[PDB]
Design a protein around this motif. Structure first.
Motif, PDB file in Angstrom:
ATOM      1  N   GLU A 179      21.932 -12.370  32.233  1.00 48.76           N
ATOM      2  CA  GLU A 179      23.189 -13.117  32.309  1.00 48.76           C
ATOM      3  C   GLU A 179      23.268 -14.211  31.235  1.00 48.76           C
ATOM      4  O   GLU A 179      24.373 -14.561  30.829  1.00 48.76           O
ATOM      5  N   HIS A 182      24.681 -12.677  28.047  1.00 51.16           N
ATOM      6  CA  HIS A 182      26.102 -12.373  28.146  1.00 51.16           C
ATOM      7  C   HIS A 182      26.997 -13.611  28.375  1.00 51.16           C
ATOM      8  O   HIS A 182      28.206 -13.452  28.368  1.00 51.16           O
ATOM      9  N   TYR A 185      26.054 -17.722  33.288  1.00 53.33           N
ATOM     10  CA  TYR A 185      24.808 -17.929  34.003  1.00 53.33           C
ATOM     11  C   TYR A 185      24.837 -19.256  34.748  1.00 53.33           C
ATOM     12  O   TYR A 185      25.649 -20.138  34.452  1.00 53.33           O
ATOM     13  N   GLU A 221      18.426  -6.506  29.100  1.00 55.30           N
ATOM     14  CA  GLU A 221      19.838  -6.263  29.346  1.00 55.30           C
ATOM     15  C   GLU A 221      20.025  -5.042  30.256  1.00 55.30           C
ATOM     16  O   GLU A 221      20.875  -5.091  31.145  1.00 55.30           O
TER      17      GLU A 221
END
Ligand SMILES: CC(C)(C)n1nc(Nc2cccc(Cl)c2)c2c(N)ncnc21
Ligand SMILES: [Ca+2]
Length: 451
Positions: A179, A182, A185, A221
Motif C-alpha cells: 500500500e 501505491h 497507507y 506488490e
C-alpha cells in the motif's frame, strides 16, 4: 528560530549514515551529556509538509516516552540544515548482534518482536507512523545481554521525502508494504514491515526476494510468499500463523500492532530448537547487504572526492604569489570557503572543527598546497575505503580471498548495477576468469564511477 546548535553542542565523532542524513556523536558544552545528532541537509532533502507541521510533530515526539523508542531531546534549524538531537545507543544494529551469537531460537525472535511491537503499538496510539521500518532502524541500547531494542527514525518519513539514490534506497524494498508503493497507507504498513522482519529472523531469507530492486518490488506488490524452505520445518505453526496475519495484503484485514502482542506465539514464547540454518542465512544476508552498501558509498566518496579535490585546488590557486605555497590562516580560509560553496560538512559543525581539521592535515604535511589537498581529501574517503575492505573480508566468510561471479551478480544486483555493465568492466581490469580478489573488485568499482 533564535537558537544555534553549535553554541550548545560540539561534534566528537561520526557515528554513521542514517535515513535523511549523517549521525554525529555530540556533547553538551555545559553539562557534558553525550547525544546522537542527525544532521539533515535542506538542499539534499525535500520537505513533504510545511514548517508548522514539522515543528508540531517534533514538539509531540519530544514529550513521548517508551523503552523501545528512541528518545528525542532537541531540534534545531539553521538556513541550510535541521538538527535532530536525541539519545545515543552503543549496542549497534540488531542483525549485527544476531550474526555474532552461535544459538538463536523462537524464544529470542519472540522477545525481539514483542519489544518492536510494544514500541509500534505505543507510537500508533499517538498517531505516529514509521513507514520505513527495517532491521537497520532496530538498535540495541547497550553492548549487554539484556539490551533493549530502540526503534529509530519514527515519524521522519511523514515530513521528509525518500531518496531516489541507490546508496540511500539499499535494503528498503524487502520491508516496504504494498500500500506504501501505491500511495494509500496508514499505520498498518508498520505491521507488514515487522512481519517481514519476523520472517527473516526465523528463516534468514526475505519473503519477497529478487535479483534487483524492481524484481523485489514486483513480488511485494503481488504479495505472494511461501513457507516452502526446509528451515520452516523446525519452526512452530503459531509463528507461521502470526506472519500470515501480519503479511495480510488488504491493510483493513491485517492484524494491528496491539492485537499482534496478544497473539498465542508472543504470549507462549515470552513466558525449543536452535535455528542454525537461519543464523547462517542472516549472516550471509547481512554480509551481502553491507558489501553492496559499502561498494555504493565507496563509489560515491570517490566522486565526491574528485569534485572537492579540483574545487579546493581552484580556491588555493586564486588565493596564491605564484610559487605554490600558502600559510595556515590562508589554508583554513580556503577550506572554510569549500564548505560555504558546497555546504557545511557533517563531521565539522563550526569554524573550530575546520581549524582543528587543518591542524591534523598539517601535522602530516609556507607549505605546498598541492600536497595539503592530497592528504586532506584522502582523510575524507578514509572511512569509505577501509569500510569496503572490511565489508569484502566479512562477506568472504570462507577466507578464500576471492568472490565468485555468482556472488558478484548477487552483490551488483542488490546495488542495482546493470549485469552487462559490470560484466564489461571486469574484462578491462582482468582479461584472463570466474572470480575476483579485493584489488580487482575495487578496480571494477573505480571503473564503474569514471576512473
Ligand atoms: C545510523 C546510526 C546507527 C549511526 N545511528 N542512527 C541513529 N539515529 C538517530 C540519531 C539522531 C537523531 C535521530 Cl532522529 C536518529 C542513532 C542513535 N540514536 N544512536 C546511535 N547511532 C545511531
Ligand atoms: Ca570467498
Amino acid at each position: 528560530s533564535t537558537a544555534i546548535f553549535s553554541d550548545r553542542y560540539k561534534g566528537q565523532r561520526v557515528l554513521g549514515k542514517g535515513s535523511f542524513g549523517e549521525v554525529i556523536l555530540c556533547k553538551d558544552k555545559i553539562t557534558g551529556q553525550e547525544c546522537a545528532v542527525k544532521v539533515i541537509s535542506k538542499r539534499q532533502v525535500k520537505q513533504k509538509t510545511d514548517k508548522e507541521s514539522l515543528l508540531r510533530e517534533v514538539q509531540l515526539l519530544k514529550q513521548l516516552d517508551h523503552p523501545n523508542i528512541m528518545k528525542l531531546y532537541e531540534f534545531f534549524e539553521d538556513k541550510g540544515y535541521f538538527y535532530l538531537v536525541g539519545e545515543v545507543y552503543t549496542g549497534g544494529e540488531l542483525f549485527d548482534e544476531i550474526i555474532s551469537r552461535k544459538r538463536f531460537s523462537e524464544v529470542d525472535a519472540a522477545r525481539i518482536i514483542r519489544q518492536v511491537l510494544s514500541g509500534i503499538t505505543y507510537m500508533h496510539k499517538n498517531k505516529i507512523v514509521h513507514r520505513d521500518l527495517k532491521p537497520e532502524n532496530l538498535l540495541l541500547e547497550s553492548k549487554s545481554k539484556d539490551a533493549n531494542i530502540r526503534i529509530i527514525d519514527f515519524g521522519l518519513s511523514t515530513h521528509f521525502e525518500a531518496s531516489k539514490k541507490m546508496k540511500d534506497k539499499i535494503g528498503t524494498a524487502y520491508y516496504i508494504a504494498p500500500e506504501v508503493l501505491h500511495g494509500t497507507y496508514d499505520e498498518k504498513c508498520d505491521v507488514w514491515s515487522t512481519g517481514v522482519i519476523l520472517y527473516i529472523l526465523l528463516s534468514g531469507c526475505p519473503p519477497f526476494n529478487g535479483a534487483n530492486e524492481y524484481d523485489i518490488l514486483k513480488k511485494v506488490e503481488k504479495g505472494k510468499y511461501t513457507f516452502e524452505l526446509p528451515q520452516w520445518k523446525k519452526v512452530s505453526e503459531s509463528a507461521k500463523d502470526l506472519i500470515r496475519k501480519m503479511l495480510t495484503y488488504v491493510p483493513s484485514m491485517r492484524i494491528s500492532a496491539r492485537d499482534a502482542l496478544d497473539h498465542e506465539w508472543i504470549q507462549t514464547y515470552t513466558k525449543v530448537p536452535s535455528l542454525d540454518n537461519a543464523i547462517l542465512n542472516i549472516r550471509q544476508f547481512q554480509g551481502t547487504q553491507k558489501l553492496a552498501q559499502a561498494a555504493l558509498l565507496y563509489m560515491g566518496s570517490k566522486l565526491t572526492s574528485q569534485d572537492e579535490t579540483k574545487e579546493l585546488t581552484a580556491i588555493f590557486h586564486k588565493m596564491d604569489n605564484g610559487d605554490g605555497q600558502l600559510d595556515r590562516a590562508e589554508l583554513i580560509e580556503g577550506y572554510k570557503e569549500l564548505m560555504r560553496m558546497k555546504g557545511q560538512d557533517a563531521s565539522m559543525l563550526d569554524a573550530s572543527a575546520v581549524e582543528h581539521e587543518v591542524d591534523q592535515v598539517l601535522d602530516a604535511v609556507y607549505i605546498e598546497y598541492s600536497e595539503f589537498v592530497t592528504v586532506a581529501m584522502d582523510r575524507k574517503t578514509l572511512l569509505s575505503r577501509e569500510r569496503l575492505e572490511r565489508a569484502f573480508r566479512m562477506f568472504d566468510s570462507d577466507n578464500s580471498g576471492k568472490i565468485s561471479s555468482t556472488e558478484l551478480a548477487t552483490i551488483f544486483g542488490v546495488s542495482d548495477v546493470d549485469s552487462e555493465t559490470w560484466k564489461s568492466v571486469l574484462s578491462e581490469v582482468d582479461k584472463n576468469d570466474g572470480e575476483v580478489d579485493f584489488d580487482e573488485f575495487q578496480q571494477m568499482l573505480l571503473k564503474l564511477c569514471g576512473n
